[PDB]
Design an enzyme around this catalytic site. Structure first.
Site, PDB file in Angstrom:
ATOM      1  N   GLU A  43       0.838  -1.158  -0.112  1.00  0.00           N
ATOM      2  CA  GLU A  43       0.011  -0.024   0.075  1.00  0.00           C
ATOM      3  C   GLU A  43       1.070   1.339   0.063  1.00  0.00           C
ATOM      4  OE1 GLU A  43      -3.218  -0.173   3.050  1.00  0.00           O
ATOM      5  OE2 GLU A  43      -3.980  -2.011   1.779  1.00  0.00           O
TER       6      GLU A  43
ATOM      7  N   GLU B 251      -5.663  -8.424  -0.877  1.00  0.00           N
ATOM      8  CA  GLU B 251      -6.580  -8.275   0.441  1.00  0.00           C
ATOM      9  C   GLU B 251      -7.780  -7.808   0.152  1.00  0.00           C
ATOM     10  OE1 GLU B 251      -4.910  -5.408   3.193  1.00  0.00           O
ATOM     11  OE2 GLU B 251      -3.014  -6.135   3.269  1.00  0.00           O
TER      12      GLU B 251
END
Length: 311
Positions: A135, A252
């Site tokens: 991220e 995810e």
């Protein structure tokens, strides 16, 4: 001459063992990875596990930025524990916050961490995948990430040409900056990963680490409009995948335990059906914590949620 689409197929269905090694100290956020977790996961039908690792807190801040022996050893124990069950394994650099806030200052340490990891695992099995950075966000903008990820690709490829590399998107790793991601043409064995948590207010309602999430508690998911909006975002990811010719991994996806159960099952089950329709690999967030599908104390899976994943 590896086929990244075959590697993606080999990766397949997975689960994240989160709130463990990506915390400051393993156990701090609730999970200590027990070797027995791998039997539990493989026996339930998964193909791989994703292991978030906060390497930045376990390496010296000064050159040569060496990774501490004990922690490297712990990561070895986790990787081999997974491999012994025939699970593919994804490792990454998770929560390197100083890099996000001042990318140029931390670039060389970041690249030194990958030189060391690649060096350590260059001869491990073909089922071990290297995920560059979890991220990217903040000052590490999409534009900057395209250059940083290429530099990471170069350090890794100068040492290892056997393992598939996994490349995320910036602006927190979802789809908002997918349009800006570019993977260099010279790189031929990489999978692009996206974290899918939309609608965010539904999946993260009440998450204590997300400012103002309390206001979303009670929100449900499951209407035809909810489903159509998700399909349209997956169609967007898919056309991007075809135009850029890169395999897709949804590293995810999950809904927090505070969300009502029926909505969690519906959302999870629909996301899985729609990713499978597109032949994507994926990893549920996460095994046994705040978004958990398995209770390690009671030694029992939430059967309906597990059904959503493997059924």
């Amino acid at each position: 001459g590896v086929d990244p689409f075959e590697r993606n197929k080999i990766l397949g269905r997975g689960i994240n063992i989160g709130n463990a090694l990506e915390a400051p100290n393993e156990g701090d956020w609730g999970v200590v990875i027990k070797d027995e977790f791998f039997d539990i996961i493989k026996e339930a039908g998964f193909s791989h596990v994703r292991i978030p690792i906060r390497w930045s807190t376990h390496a010296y801040a000064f050159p040569p930025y060496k990774i501490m022996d004990r922690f490297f050893k712990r990561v070895d124990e986790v990787i081999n524990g997974a491999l012994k069950r025939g699970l593919a394994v994804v490792i990454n650099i998770h929560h390197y916050e100083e890099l996000m806030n001042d990318p140029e200052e931390h670039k060389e340490r970041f690249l030194a961490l990958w030189k060391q990891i690649a060096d350590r695992y260059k001869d491990y099995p073909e089922t071990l995948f290297f995920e560059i950075l979890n991220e990217p966000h903040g000052n590490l903008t999409p534009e900057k990430w395209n250059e940083l990820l290429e530099e990471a690709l170069k350090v890794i490829r100068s040492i290892d040409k056997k393992h598939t590399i996994i490349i995320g998107t910036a602006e927190w790793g979802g789809i908002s900056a997918l349009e800006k991601l570019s993977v260099p043409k010279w790189e031929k064995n990489s999978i692009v990963t996206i974290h899918y948590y939309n609608p965010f207010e539904f999946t993260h309602q009440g998450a204590e680490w997300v400012e103002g999430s309390e206001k979303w508690l009670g929100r449900k998911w499951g209407s035809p409009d909810d489903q159509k909006h998700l399909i349209e975002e997956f169609n967007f990811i898919e056309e991007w995948s075809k135009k850029n010719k890169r395999p897709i991994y949804i590293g995810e996806f999950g809904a927090y335990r505070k969300a009502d159960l029926e909505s969690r099952i519906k959302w999870t089950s629909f996301v899985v059906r729609e990713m499978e329709k597109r032949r994507w690999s994926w990893a549920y967030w996460e095994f046994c914590s705040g978004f958990g599908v398995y209770d390690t104390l009671r030694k029992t899976w939430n059967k309906d949620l597990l059904e959503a994943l493997i059924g």
